[PDB]
Amino acid sequence: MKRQWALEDFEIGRPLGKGKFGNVYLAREKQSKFILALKVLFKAQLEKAGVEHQLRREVEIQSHLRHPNILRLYGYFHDATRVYLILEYAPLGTVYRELQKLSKFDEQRTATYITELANALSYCHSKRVIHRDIKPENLLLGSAGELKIADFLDYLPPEMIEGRMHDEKVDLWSLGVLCYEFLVGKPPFEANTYQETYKRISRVEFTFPDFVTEGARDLISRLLKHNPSQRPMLREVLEHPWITANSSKPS
Ligand SMILES: CCCC(=O)Nc1n[nH]c2cc(-c3ccc(O)cc3)ccc12
């Protein structure tokens, strides 16, 4: 059995974002007055892009994922022409916004984010879920500033762009790209053209600014290994001395 939700059950607030298949609004559940976000998807648009099959597959997975660093999908419902997703509300916004405001993150904030991401990714893997889009724009912040993965070229690993087989190790690479962007302000393989970026990634060609410490370089260099098997395991990330020295939160 399950709960039956309806549009009438929520008081719609301000728009939080405008996506390709619809809008996300802040909402208040009429009964409990609980604050949450309502993602409104349009069927006509989902069909025209034949992503329906994908939406349905992500919703099923997202429903079974319960982790403090993963945005919660509370439920869903639909009507004549729209599909509604009931989501957790992250009051402090996106890491992307924070990154743009600060230009770059200090070691403590970065180490903490990487710790939360590694824990979320470890949980995902334990549930056979892999390849999460953890770009800054897909990362939300909870009431206490805790990270929340919200995913319902600069970050693709060599194996994917080179047209090869990939596994959970792609998430390790992603973590490396993010750690660098957090500390630096921009992803490591940025270039003028897609072609140049692909080449930068394939050859694992990137440089460190002078303010990136030895500990960070060690971790990032290890995560960004061309050969997936050479990349550390998530628990090794969590035990990395740079992480245990700077993370304001335990694993
Ligand atoms: C200061 C306000 C901060 C804010 O907007 N916070 C948010 N809480 N919950 C969300 C869900 C999404 C979302 C994610 C993925 C998706 O497909 C649809 C919607 C986007 C943003 C938020």
Choose the final residue of a domain: 93, 126, 151: 93
Whether residues 12 and 24 fall in one domain: yes
Residue ending a domain, among 93, 125, 146, is: 93
Method: X-ray
148 lines ligand 1 (CB under 6 A): no
Residues 112 and 224 both lie in one domain: yes
What distances in angstroms separate CA 36 from CA 4, 32, 72, 137, one per listed residue? Answer: 17, 11, 10, 19
| CATH code of the domain in which 106 resides | 1.10.510.10
Same domain flag for 46 and 111: no
Instruction: Read off the tokens for 114.
Output: 């990487």
Six-digit token string for 95: 């890491």
Beta bridge partners of 42: 82
In the chain, residues preceding a discontinuity (C to N beyond 2.5 A) are 152
Distance CA 104, CA 110 (A): 9
Q: Which residues are annotated as a binding site for ATP?
A: 20, 39, 88-90, 137-138, 151
Residues 110 and 225 in one domain: yes
What CATH number is associated with residue 69?
Answer: 3.30.200.20
Rounded Cα gap, residues 251 and 249, in angstroms: 7
Same domain, 106 and 204: yes
Q: Are residues 65 and 145 in the same domain?
A: no
Atom of ligand 1 nearest to the CA of 151: 15
Q: For tokens 């053209």, what's the residue?
A: 193
The verdict on 133 and 158 lying in the same domain is yes
Same domain, 26 and 99: no
The domain boundary, picked from 93, 113, 140, lies at 93
Do residue 60 and residue 181 come from a single domain? no
Distance CA 198, CA 78 (A): 40
Same domain for 122 and 108, yes or no, is yes
Q: What is the domain count for the chain?
A: 2
Query: Which 3 state secondary structure label does DSSP give 247?
Result: coil
Alpha helices in 127-169 (DSSP H): 158-161
Resolution (A): 2.1
Does residue 104 sit in the same domain as residue 211? yes
* Residue 1, C-beta contacts closer than 8 angstroms, at least 6 positions apart: none
DSSP per-residue codes, 192-245: SSHHHHHHHHHTT-----TTS-HHHHHHHHHHT-SSGGGSPPHHHHHT-HHHHH
Is residue 23 domain-shared with residue 103, that is, in the same domain?
Answer: no
Pocket test for ligand 1, best of 14, 21, 24 (most atoms within 8 A of CB): 24
The residue range of the domain holding 232 is 94-247
Question: Computed from CA positions of residues 35, 90, 243, 233, in that sequence, does the dihedral angle turn out positive or negative?
Answer: positive
